[PDB]
């Protein structure tokens, strides 16, 4: 668990950095908006899941 | 300390508090990019 | 020649330079000479 946790958290951090750049750029980008809206929904659902994963896994490494 | 499992993230935690200041500075970068119009 | 490297980038990069060098000087207030330690 002490790696499946540390990856889940490193995954949450990396995705967060990608969303931090990607979401504003997408929202203010003229074209390519249909492929953006899909990815933003995907990014979002994945970020939420990873938070729940890191949160649950917290209790197996603390 | 943070609980030991989170220790590798210490250095990141050290910097996060400054991020709000970077938002104020970002407002100026943005405005320079549109010529302070 | 010209206006190749936009002024907003020059400003942002040079401003970040200033912050780094001044930040370094603040670091030095707490380490080595002048630190009281």
């Amino acid at each position: 668990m002490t790696i499946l946790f540390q990856l889940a958290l490193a995954a949450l951090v990396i995705l967060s950095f990608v969303m931090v750049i990607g979401v504003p750029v997408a929202y203010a980008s003229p074209q390519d908006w249909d492929r953006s809206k899909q990815l933003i929904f995907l990014g979002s659902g994945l970020w939420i899941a990873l938070v729940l994963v890191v949160g649950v896994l917290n209790f197996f490494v603390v | 300390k943070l609980p030991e499992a989170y220790a590798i993230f210490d250095p990141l935690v050290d910097v996060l508090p400054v991020i709000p200041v970077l938002f104020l500075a970002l407002a100026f970068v943005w405005q320079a990019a549109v010529g302070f119009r | 020649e010209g206006g190749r490297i936009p002024l907003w980038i020059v400003a942002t990069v040079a401003g970040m330079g200033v912050i780094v060098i001044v930040g370094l000087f603040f670091y030095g207030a707490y380490a080595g000479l002048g630190s009281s330690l």
């Binding site: 504003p24 | 970002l26 970068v29 | -």
Partner: peptide, 29 residues
């Protein structure tokens, strides 16, 4: 420490990168 400076460099580039990307792509700045 290299780790703190590296985090602060990456976090500090993110903001201007958003602006640079949008300006390149003639976005809604």
């Amino acid at each position: 420490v290299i780790a703190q400076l590296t985090m602060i460099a990456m976090i500090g580039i993110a903001g201007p990168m958003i602006i640079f990307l949008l300006a390149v792509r003639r976005g809604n700045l």
